């Protein structure tokens, strides 16, 4: 019958979706319902002919587009991406009224995206009442973190009553990539130490000991850790308090600066795109050079820092938009980690992403370096497929 | 004639002082003029019989105490501890009107302590007009940091116009300890990679490549990096912004919490003193255990992170109150760094601080581990003595 999985990702102003074959996890259809909540909303199926509304309206359009393509009868599972699962979700679950209630409980931890996810769930339940639906969380993989790894240095009341703690993100990616690495590197999952560098527009490092996440660079919010596209990353709180006095800016004013105006875009004053910055550096632009150098320095710093949660380091894995495609960043990051005895294979590192799961380190390297393309829709689908066998 | 150096440290509410022999750098007198700016002020010479006023009043008392001890005629040099030298000071200098003017320029970077230092300089110039006086800066050693190491991910204007950047502290300690390490470990200064862990009430890590500071854990303020006695250390700015909404606290309200109420005291809810917390952990107290475990985790994390600024790691050096005396912390931190191939010599690590400069790592260790007691007054004096030969 060739059943399919409908993967849904509801952002603050967009609904991204994919349709994957159950047997192969091949993408059969992809799209994005952009410009949400605004009066102008457009659906772009397969990147062609935009056609012109609330969250349910956009999904009803997608459902009617699958109905006219005769795929509605093949949708056996629906996968939902949830931004934040708090401490309540440690893995992917079958959606029920209880799960919805519990997602709503943790929604204050991400008031923007989580309510959009619930809107996507409410709509998909209305349109597909007979289809099994699953929730896959960004945070769930990092719930194996020890208290010493997730606690902040703040007073205990902030953690006990307010729930302030490290959660970490890109967890679905970090899990997927780690699983693939045991195959590629011929490692035993239960006797392994990996560092996964997820480098995209948002970026995080994760240390994976014996199949479990033990440290990750993002905190309670996606703002901590690595410097990113428009995100500052680690920043001295005293420096932020010093700025507030000099500029007369509040905490909310500076939160927007840290999130939207900082990072690669902030230092260079040009772009959050590395392709632009690399060219500018070769064209002699110094602020683009510094932005990249700082980006690399902070990546090296966190990769090495995260390695302290491992007993033995077996592999460093690059993934995400930047991790998969930037030959320069990988070279610089690896060369910034000679202290861990890394040796780069320059020609292998030059190979484009089309070569997929690949080794980029030379033989004398003490630690294997690799690129593994991340596929978050596939992991969502694979979780959905596995949960498809359940009788509940 | 046996000339001496008068070392002065002016805090926000105290004047600490020592008198060191020029030839040996042996402490001949030590004291503290505490309770400054308040109406009750007491001078404690050698920890006996407190005797009972502005910054000049307290120093005039010290000067009269040296006059009655017949040492005033032996004071050939006066050393001043300056909290912050901005970007203007890269080393210890002979104090002139120009230097004073320039210290005043950078005093907005530390409005509390720096003006107290200038008050100590103004007073010491009044009391000892014929004595050479030198300034030694907490920040100066970290001025060798590359832009990639000291820049934050914030927009460029914050660095260019406001001067927001990493400065780092304990620089005098980090320099001194690093110099001693080349002797103890038989290393060539110009071909070496050290990590210095300064663990006291305030704590910082510093990476020293070829004699130069290349990375350090504190930032623009002493609030960034390691979790400390009452300091939180690295904290997600988004988490702080999240708290502000829930509690209704401002940025200044949270700065005091981060600085005075957090850290070891914050998590344990008991003490900032490790001796208390160690006993409590053995007595079964869980929050004291977690405070120490988090303290160690964050130390391990930064030591390993800082090692990425080195090409070869030769030694890890412990110093400061905790680094010198805490057998437990050293054991746990080293055992948390098996990834760097560290091997602890348990019996050597048990040796008390009276054994001074000592190796605590076993032979199979890939990296030498050592304790080197820090002496900031001596480094101030040694800088003063060297600058004593100058004709200006």
Choose the closest CB to B339 out of A263, A266, A313. Answer: A313
A199, A233 in Cβ contact below 8 A?
no
Least Cα distance to B318 among B174, B218, B124 occurs for B174
Chain-centroid distance of CA B51 in Å reads: 29
Read off the tokens for B288: 């004291």
A306 annotated among ligand-binding-site residues: no
Of A169, A186, A203, which marks where a domain is finished?
A186
Q: How far apart are CA B135 and CA B141, in angstroms?
A: 13
Of A186, A213, A247, which marks where a domain is finished?
A186
Q: How far apart are CA B194 and CA B310, in angstroms?
A: 8
Q: How many residues does chain A have?
A: 392
For A64, the domain range is: 1-186
Q: How far apart are CA B333 and CA A54, in angstroms?
A: 53
B239, B254 in Cβ contact below 8 A?
no
Least Cα distance to B151 among A305, A262, A36 occurs for A262
Q: How far apart are CA A225 and CA A231, in angstroms?
A: 9
Q: Is A270 an interface residue toward B (CB < 8 Å)?
A: no
Among chain A residues, CA nearest to B166: A236
Neighbours of B108 (CB within 10 A): 15
Of B186, B214, B237, which marks where a domain is finished?
B186
Q: How far apart are CA A244 and CA A305, in angstroms?
A: 30
Which residues in chain A touch residue B301, judged by CB atoms under 8 angstroms apart?
A: 215, 305-306, 308-309
Q: How far apart are CA B217 and CA B195, in angstroms?
A: 11
- Report DSSP state, residue A10: E
Answer yes or no: do A221 and B242 touch at CB < 8 A. Answer: yes
A329, A199 in Cβ contact below 8 A?
yes
> Number of folded domains in chain A?
2
Measured torsion, CA atoms of residues A281, A287, A291, A293, in degrees rounded to the nearest 10: 60
Interface of B with A in 188-227 (CB under 8 A): 193, 215, 218-224, 227
Helix (H, G, I), strand (E, B) or coil at B300: helix
Q: Which helix (H) or strand (E) holds B5?
A: strand B4-10
Q: How far apart are CA A150 and CA A172, in angstroms?
A: 18
Neighbours of B289 (CB within 10 A): 19
Report the relative pairing of strands A4-10 and B42-45 from DSSP bridges: unpaired
Helix (H, G, I), strand (E, B) or coil at A95: coil
Residues paired with residue A16 on neighbouring β-strands, in sequence order: A9, A32
Count A/B contacts: CB-CB distance under 8 Å. Answer: 248
Residues B172 and B290 reside in one and the same domain = no
Which residues in chain B touch residue A305, judged by CB atoms under 8 angstroms apart?
A: 301-302, 304-305
- Write the CATH number for B33: 3.30.420.40
Helix (H, G, I), strand (E, B) or coil at A231: coil
Residues A154-158: contacts with CB within 8 Å, 24+ apart?
A: A154/B232, A154/B235, A154/B257, A154/B258, A154/B262, A154/B266, A155/B257, A155/B261, A155/B262, A155/B266, A155/B267, A155/B269, A156/B266, A156/B267, A156/B268, A156/B269, A156/B287, A158/B243
- Report DSSP state, residue A135: E
Least Cα distance to A388 among A17, A66, A141, A133 occurs for A133
Among chain B residues, CA nearest to A336: B308
Neighbours of A359 (CB within 10 A): 18
Sheet strands (E) in chain B: 4-10, 14-21, 27-34, 42-45, 75-82, 93-94, 132-137, 193-199, 203-209, 212-216, 315-319, 358-359, 368-371
B236 annotated among ligand-binding-site residues: no
* Residue A202 CB contacts under 8 Å (≥ 6 apart), including other chains: A169, A170, A222, A228, A229, A231
Helix (H, G, I), strand (E, B) or coil at A299: helix
Placement of tokens 């679950």 in the chain:
A93
* Residue A54 CB contacts under 8 Å (≥ 6 apart), including other chains: A36, A37, A119
Residues A193 and A282 reside in one and the same domain = yes
Read off the tokens for B122: 């103004």
Placement of tokens 């500052």 in the chain:
A232
Helix (H, G, I), strand (E, B) or coil at A203: strand
Query: From the candidates A112, A236, A343, which should be mutated to test the interface with B, based on the most B CB atoms within 10 A?
Result: A236
A154, B232 in Cβ contact below 8 A?
yes
Helix (H, G, I), strand (E, B) or coil at B97: helix
Interface of B with A in 298-337 (CB under 8 A): 298, 300-313, 336-337
Choose the closest CB to B311 out of A263, A267, A338. Answer: A338
Neighbours of B282 (CB within 10 A): 10
Which residues in chain B touch residue A240, judged by CB atoms under 8 angstroms apart?
A: 237, 251
B304 CB-side CA count, 13 A: 29
Number of H helices, E strands in chain A: 15, 13
Read off the tokens for A10: 């509801």
B341, B304 in Cβ contact below 8 A?
no
SS3 content of chain B, % helix, strand, coil (to 5): 45, 20, 35
Least Cα distance to B59 among B7, B99, B22, B20 occurs for B7
B84, B109 in Cβ contact below 8 A?
yes
Helix (H, G, I), strand (E, B) or coil at B317: strand
- Choosing from B34, B97, B138, B345, the catalytic residue is B138
Neighbours of B186 (CB within 10 A): 8
Least Cα distance to B264 among B239, B234, B294 occurs for B294
B375 annotated among ligand-binding-site residues: no
Helix (H, G, I), strand (E, B) or coil at A85: coil
Placement of tokens 């923007």 in the chain:
A112
Q: Kindly list the distances between the CA atom of residue A286 and the CA atoms of A268, B139, B147, B148, B246, in Å, as whole numbers in the listed order.
A: 8, 26, 11, 12, 42
Nearest-CA distance from A86 to chain B in Å? 14
Neighbours of B100 (CB within 10 A): 15
Chain-centroid distance of CA B94 in Å reads: 21
Answer yes or no: do B293 and A148 touch at CB < 8 A. Answer: yes
Residues A59 and A74 reside in one and the same domain = yes
| Phi and psi torsions of B100, nearest 5° | -60, -50
Least Cα distance to A55 among A99, A105, A140, A116 occurs for A116
Q: How far apart are CA B114 and CA B93, in angstroms?
A: 16
SS3 content of chain A, % helix, strand, coil (to 5): 45, 20, 35
Q: How far apart are CA A203 and CA A10, in angstroms?
A: 20
Q: Which helix (H) or strand (E) holds B245?
A: helix B237-247
Read off the tokens for A319: 């993934």
Q: How far apart are CA B29 and CA B121, in angstroms?
A: 20
Residues paired with residue B301 on neighbouring β-strands, in sequence order: none
Q: Is B31 an interface residue toward A (CB < 8 Å)?
A: no
A170 annotated among ligand-binding-site residues: yes
B386 annotated among ligand-binding-site residues: no
Report the relative pairing of strands A358-359 and B14-21 from DSSP bridges: unpaired
Nearest-CA distance from B249 to chain A in Å? 10
Answer yes or no: do A235 and B304 touch at CB < 8 A. Answer: no
A13, A35 in Cβ contact below 8 A?
yes
Burial of B73 (0-12, 13-18, 19+ CB in 10 A): exposed
Helix (H, G, I), strand (E, B) or coil at A370: strand
B339, A306 in Cβ contact below 8 A?
no
Residues A226 and A174 reside in one and the same domain = no
Q: Kindly list the distances between the CA atom of residue B49 and the CA atoms of B31, B63, B71, in Å, as whole numbers in the listed order.
A: 11, 18, 20
* Residue B87 CB contacts under 8 Å (≥ 6 apart), including other chains: B106, B143, B163, B165
Read off the tokens for B138: 């907490």
Q: How far apart are CA B349 and CA B331, in angstroms?
A: 7
Read off the tokens for A374: 């991340």
DSSP H helical segments within A42-155, as ranges? Answer: 55-67, 97-106, 113-127, 147-150
Q: Is B138 a catalytic residue?
A: yes
Residues paired with residue B33 on neighbouring β-strands, in sequence order: B15, B43
Q: Is B256 an interface residue toward A (CB < 8 Å)?
A: no
Residues B233 and B158 reside in one and the same domain = no
Among chain A residues, CA nearest to B262: A154
b/e A251-279 (16+ beta carbons within 10 angstroms → b): beebbebbbebbbbbbbbeebbbbeebbe
Which residues in chain A touch residue B150, judged by CB atoms under 8 angstroms apart?
A: none
Q: How far apart are CA B217 and CA B194, in angstroms?
A: 14
Interface of A with B in 70-89 (CB under 8 A): none
| Phi and psi torsions of A145, nearest 5° | -60, 135
Placement of tokens 């720096």 in the chain:
B114
Residues A131 and A214 reside in one and the same domain = no
Neighbours of A347 (CB within 10 A): 9
Q: Which helix (H) or strand (E) holds B15?
A: strand B14-21
- Choosing from A34, A138, A215, A314, the catalytic residue is A138
Read off the tokens for A317: 């894995």
Helix B327-335, helix B274-282: angle, nearest 10: 70
Number of H helices, E strands in chain B: 15, 13
Which residues in chain B touch residue A206, judged by CB atoms under 8 angstroms apart?
A: none
B144, A254 in Cβ contact below 8 A?
no
Among chain A residues, CA nearest to B338: A311
Breakpoints of chain B, after residues (C–N > 2.5 Å): 52
A18, A380 in Cβ contact below 8 A?
no
Residues B208 and B166 reside in one and the same domain = no
Residues A182 and A73 reside in one and the same domain = yes
First to last CA, chain A: 23
Measured torsion, CA atoms of residues A144, A146, A152, A157, in degrees rounded to the nearest 10: 90
B183 annotated among ligand-binding-site residues: no
B323 CB-side CA count, 13 A: 31
Burial of A355 (0-12, 13-18, 19+ CB in 10 A): exposed
A16 annotated among ligand-binding-site residues: yes
Q: How far apart are CA A116 and CA A136, in angstroms?
A: 14
| Phi and psi torsions of B221, nearest 5° | -120, 165
Q: What is the CA radius of gyration of chain B?
A: 21
First to last CA, chain B: 23
B91, B77 in Cβ contact below 8 A?
no
Answer yes or no: do A302 and B305 touch at CB < 8 A. Answer: yes
Q: How far apart are CA A153 and CA B264, in angstroms?
A: 7
* Nearest-5° Cα angle at A141, A135 to A143: 105
Q: Is A2 an interface residue toward B (CB < 8 Å)?
A: no
Residues A354-362: contacts with CB within 8 Å, 24+ apart?
A: A357/A180, A357/A184, A359/A184, A360/A318, A360/A330, A360/A334, A361/A334
Placement of tokens 């104090």 in the chain:
B95
DSSP string spanning B28-55? Answer: EEEEEEES-SSS--EEEETT---B---H
Which residues in chain B touch residue A306, judged by CB atoms under 8 angstroms apart?
A: 301
Least Cα distance to B45 among B24, B61, B60, B26 occurs for B61
A152, A237 in Cβ contact below 8 A?
no
Answer yes or no: do B308 and A304 touch at CB < 8 A. Answer: yes
Read off the tokens for B258: 């981060």
- Report DSSP state, residue B212: E
Q: How many residues does chain B have?
A: 392
Q: Kindly list the distances between the CA atom of residue A388 and the CA atoms of A7, A27, A175, A384, in Å, as whole numbers in the listed order.
A: 14, 18, 20, 6
Which residues in chain B touch residue A236, judged by CB atoms under 8 angstroms apart?
A: 152, 166, 218-221, 223-224
| Phi and psi torsions of A103, nearest 5° | -65, -40
Q: Is B363 an interface residue toward A (CB < 8 Å)?
A: no
Q: How far apart are CA B104 and CA B107, in angstroms?
A: 5
Residues B240 and B270 reside in one and the same domain = yes
Placement of tokens 């007198």 in the chain:
B29
Residues B213 and B238 reside in one and the same domain = yes
Least Cα distance to B221 among B99, B308, B138, B307 occurs for B138
Sheet strands (E) in chain A: 4-10, 14-21, 27-34, 42-45, 75-82, 93-94, 132-137, 193-199, 203-209, 212-216, 315-319, 358-359, 368-371
Residues B251 and B213 reside in one and the same domain = yes
B43 annotated among ligand-binding-site residues: no
Residues B83 and B114 reside in one and the same domain = yes
């Amino acid at each position: 019958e060739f059943p399919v999985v409908l993967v849904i990702n509801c952002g603050s102003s967009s609904i991204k979706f994919s349709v994957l074959d159950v047997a192969t996890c091949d993408v059969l259809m992809a799209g994005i319902a952009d410009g949400m909540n605004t009066e102008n909303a457009f659906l772009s199926i397969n990147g062609d002919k935009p056609i012109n509304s609330n969250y349910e309206d956009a999904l009803k359009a997608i459902a009617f587009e699958l109905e006219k393509r005769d795929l509605t009868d093949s949708v056996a599972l629906i996968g939902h991406r949830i931004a934040h699962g708090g401490e309540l979700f440690t893995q992917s679950v079958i959606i029920t009224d209880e799960i919805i209630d519990n997602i709503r409980r943790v929604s204050p931890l991400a008031p923007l995206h989580n309510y959009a996810n619930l809107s996507g769930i409410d709509a998909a339940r209305h349109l597909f009442p007979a289809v099994r639906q699953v929730a896959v969380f960004d945070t769930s993989f990092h719930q194996t973190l020890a208290p010493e790894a997730y606690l902040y240095g703040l007073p205990w009341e902030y953690f006990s009553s307010l729930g302030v703690r490290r959660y970490g993100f890109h967890g679905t990616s970090h899990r997927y990539v780690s699983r693939r690495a045991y195959e590629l590197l011929d490692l035993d999952e239960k006797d392994s130490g990996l560092i996964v560098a997820h480098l995209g527009n948002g970026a995080s490092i994760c240390a994976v000991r014996n199949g479990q996440s033990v440290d990750t660079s993002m905190g309670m919010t996606p703002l901590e850790g690595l410097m990113m596209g428009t995100r500052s990353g680690d920043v001295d709180f005293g420096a932020m308090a010093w700025i507030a006095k000099e500029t007369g800016q509040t905490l909310s004013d500076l939160e927007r600066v840290v999130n939207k105006e900082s990072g690669l875009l902030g230092i260079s004053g040009l772009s959050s795109d590395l392709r632009v910055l690399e060219k500018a550096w070769h064209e002699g632009h110094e602020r683009a050079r510094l932005a990249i150098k700082t980006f690399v320095h902070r990546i090296a710093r966190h990769i090495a820092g995260h390695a302290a949660s491992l007993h033995r380091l077996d592999g460093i894995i690059f993934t995400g938009g930047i991790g998969e495609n930037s030959v320069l960043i990988r070279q610089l990051v690896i060369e910034h980690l000679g202290v861990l005895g890394l040796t780069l294979d320059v020609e292998m590192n030059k190979q484009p992403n089309s070569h997929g799961e690949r080794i980029i380190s030379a033989n004398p390297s003490q630690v294997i370096c690799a690129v593994i393309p991340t596929n978050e829709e596939k992991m969502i689908a694979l979780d959905a497929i596995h949960l498809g066998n359940v009788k509940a």
